[PDB]
Design a protein around this ligand. Structure first.
Ligand SMILES: C[Si](C)(O[Si](C)(C)c1cccc2sc(C(=O)N3CCC(c4cccc(CN)c4)CC3)cc12)c1cccc2sc(C(=O)N3CCC(c4cccc(CN)c4)CC3)cc12
Ligand SMILES: C[Si](C)(O[Si](C)(C)c1cccc2sc(C(=O)N3CCC(c4cccc(CN)c4)CC3)cc12)c1cccc2sc(C(=O)N3CCC(c4cccc(CN)c4)CC3)cc12
Ligand SMILES: [Cl-]
Ligand SMILES: [Cl-]
Ligand SMILES: [Cl-]
Ligand SMILES: [Cl-]
Lengths: 243, 242, 242, 243
């Protein structure tokens, strides 16, 4: 997270950390708890190449990475089959947990938006994670969970912005219709936040609009953060995850 | 270049080296001389983002990098407008030099294929460059130009390989129709070779079948090297190059 | 710390962590509380070159680095005037804190040895720290304080080991009389542990026999860990610490 | 070499490059040809730990490293036995070549000074090598041999300078009597030059005053380059190398 600050302990009960087996269980991506037994994340965190399940675990909402871990095994990785790279899209995946978590005030699911939901431009949304605090700048120990408010932007503007300073034909799409953008040169998601949630409070209730997917660096001019658009993939999500 | 060997001095007179300004004018991509005033390379060497022309030079065929540089400034960078990333395609670009070079036995242009040539499996093809000699393994000084003969694989076969060990749906195409596959686990191009030429000998003439573009690593199982298919982009090249 | 294990919370209440200002206040050396206002450490952690005091803080005993820091500024750095490098000796220094700390069961001072104590082979001794767990192998988060029991080796035996596989003349002393050796190929201190304490239990009291100083790597054949011998430097410590 | 420039092809015929076996025969130290069959270099380049002879070769005077190598095997490494670290001193070693080289205008020995020779302060001497051109700044390809003029300084001043900005007692020696200093904040030897020659022209003839040994960085304030003082070790050198 660039330009944000440490989250209050009561906030973002759905945030999770995906961990890879090594000399320690290292954080490499975020995710969100969307059902007691399901984690939503970005496909690029776990593909397109097939990876070993035993070398992956999930950590639910932690204020500081690694201090008090209770790692949860994963029973299935479901990567969207249209996924090959973030820039082509379908950057979305599900992790089925081996047990349903017992939900609490501190740890609980985020609500997915209705298919019709549209998140208008300018809407103050929030993204959260434990990724880099700027380009090639790691989150320092003790690794607080961070949060930052980012405005939604219309795809047409986000796409037009990606073309400024680029050779790509202005009529050749860069930001695709299953993506969603947010952020500016002060507030952005960054490396290690991927997979985690962009959430917007609508009618006083938090909806997951986006899954952190990619961008050109972090908080660079004319290069907002790009997210997988959750509404786009509801039917695929609901193919596996109970309403 | 993975596998293969140092090129003889008389071979590949069209090979060039692209250099970026820094503590020294460092090699970062290949290219090929296709006209006295034009270099063909990969878009991803020079975009998608617009860069300062003054920080880019071209070196014509040299047997060892850096030892006898005579660097040439560029007047224009022309990047295929459909290009955004190499995994999508249109990984192709043209550099116009400030001056026409003088050609000779040692330095001269490569011939572009006719539009109908498909370069099928079993064609004798070579890729050349000063790139890595394996995954994360730099070419050692004195940086000789390397070559390796690489076997062409049909696109459909190459696409199906790229699906082994992947989540990607089989009907979701990875290797596109504007790409070409060549190489195996002993013979491939690698980082640093991008933008340079894959050339095949057809009726005694060397034709540039491809431009080194991408792959999943270098010389890995089921992941042949991927090239931009030059025939696909002839009309675009000919909007600029006589 | 190579070998060994995470320290229990009730052990080593004198352990401290030295921090350098940067993107975060990073741990770079150990130390030991020897008085409420004084930390004992290795010179090479803080010299030979004079550094800005404002860029240095001390953290008192903490079970995990960084998680609950309450950092303490330093008023003075006092470096043994004979110190230049750790291989020569006098690798010892004192930090005076701006305020006296408050002591307790969890945080309190270590006892310095009487001048006559020599710490012979077979004494039970432990070294503690948040340093590397092997050569070029960082302590992983969450950075627990580690301990390991290390066997003392007589200086003369340690010196002769340091000569095996070396050109250095046998009569040319490597391990000096103001140093102490402990450890083997399974149990040692390592980078990051420097300045912290080697403590041995004598008549029921923990005595600080050494300050972690140097070695040829960590836990390598014939290269035990080398420590500054605290008894040698008592008079100097007592010029400053009550 | 810091602050210098590429040497003329005719100069420094005695300079050599020591090479270590790896993915290529990489330069790690300089040396000087002091007899047809002997190379003088710094002990720290080859010790104090005993190293494998087969993984070491010598390259005589090359204008550019690696372009035209003709590597020479070494038959013996002789490290001064009083050597353990550069800061304690005796940082001096000999390499005996397996063959005497056939000497030419382009490649030939440097003359060692007489035991009595004293190189007065202020004397313009030269150091040469293929080391870093500043602190943590590698010599770029194509690796020209560089040269720089550095003045000799008296040990007492070099030692006094090392004490400025240091905790070390002013009466506790840093620069020892078998060492020699030269250079300033514009002109210095640096990493990878170690082992190579500091040469001074006396009575119109080149004498090797120094062997590049150590220092605190390169060309830093109050921290001149320290050299092993060749006159100090003549009798040891002549114990092995014919007059
Ligand atoms: C790792 Si990759 C080179 O692409 Si990028 C992820 C650097 C990339 C591609 C296109 C646009 C952007 S934009 C961007 C970026 O700036 N990032 C990543 C996203 C990140 C981020 C993260 C979260 C949130 C935000 C929003 N602020 C931003 C910020 C930094 C990275 C990118 C890559 C992608 C997909 C498939 C492959 S396969 C592959 C690969 O294995 N190689 C590269 C090709 C190479 C090769 C060269 C020549 C010849 C051959 C044939 N043998 C092979 C071998 C090695 C690399 C890739
Ligand atoms: C950085 Si240094 C060469 O010492 Si070392 C740490 C590599 C070292 C010297 C001698 C023996 C050992 S043994 C060892 C080691 O293996 N370590 C460090 C200790 C560590 C450790 C730590 C704690 C506990 C243990 C016990 N298990 C072990 C394990 C790893 C390191 C060493 C050094 C020491 C003292 C003064 C200086 S000044 C200096 C310096 O600035 N440079 C080196 C010289 C160089 C130079 C070259 C040519 C010409 C010039 C003139 N311009 C300058 C410039 C850069 C470096 C040093
Ligand atoms: Cl929209
Ligand atoms: Cl071949
Ligand atoms: Cl133990
Ligand atoms: Cl003198």
């Amino acid at each position: 997270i660039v330009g944000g600050q440490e989250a209050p302990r009561s906030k973002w009960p759905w945030q999770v950390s995906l961990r890879v087996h090594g000399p320690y269980w290292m954080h490499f991506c975020g995710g969100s708890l969307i059902h007691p037994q399901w984690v939503l994340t970005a496909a690029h965190c776990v593909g397109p190449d097939v990876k070993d399940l035993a070398a992956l675990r999930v950590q639910l909402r932690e204020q500081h990475l690694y201090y008090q871990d209770q790692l949860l095994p994963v029973s299935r990785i479901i990567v969207h089959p249209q996924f090959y790279t973030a820039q082509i899209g379908a950057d979305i995946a599900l992790l089925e947990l081996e047990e349903p978590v017992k939900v609490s005030s501190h740890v609980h699911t985020v609500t997915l938006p209705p298919a019709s939901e549209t998140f208008p431009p300018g809407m103050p949304c929030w993204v959260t994670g434990w990724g880099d605090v700027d380009n090639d700048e790691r989150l320092p120990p003790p690794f607080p969970l961070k949060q930052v408010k980012v405005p939604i932007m219309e795809n047409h503007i986000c796409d037009a912005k990606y073309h400024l300073g680029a050779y790509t034909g202005d009529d050749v799409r860069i930001v695709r219709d299953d993506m969603l953008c947010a952020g500016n040169t002060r507030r952005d998601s960054c490396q290690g936040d991927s997979g985690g949630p962009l959430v917007c409070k609508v009618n006083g209730t938090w909806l997951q609009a986006g899954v952190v997917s990619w961008g050109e660096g972090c908080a660079q001019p004319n290069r907002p953060g790009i997210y997988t658009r959750v509404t786009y993939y509801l039917d695929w999500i609901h193919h596996y995850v109970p309403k």
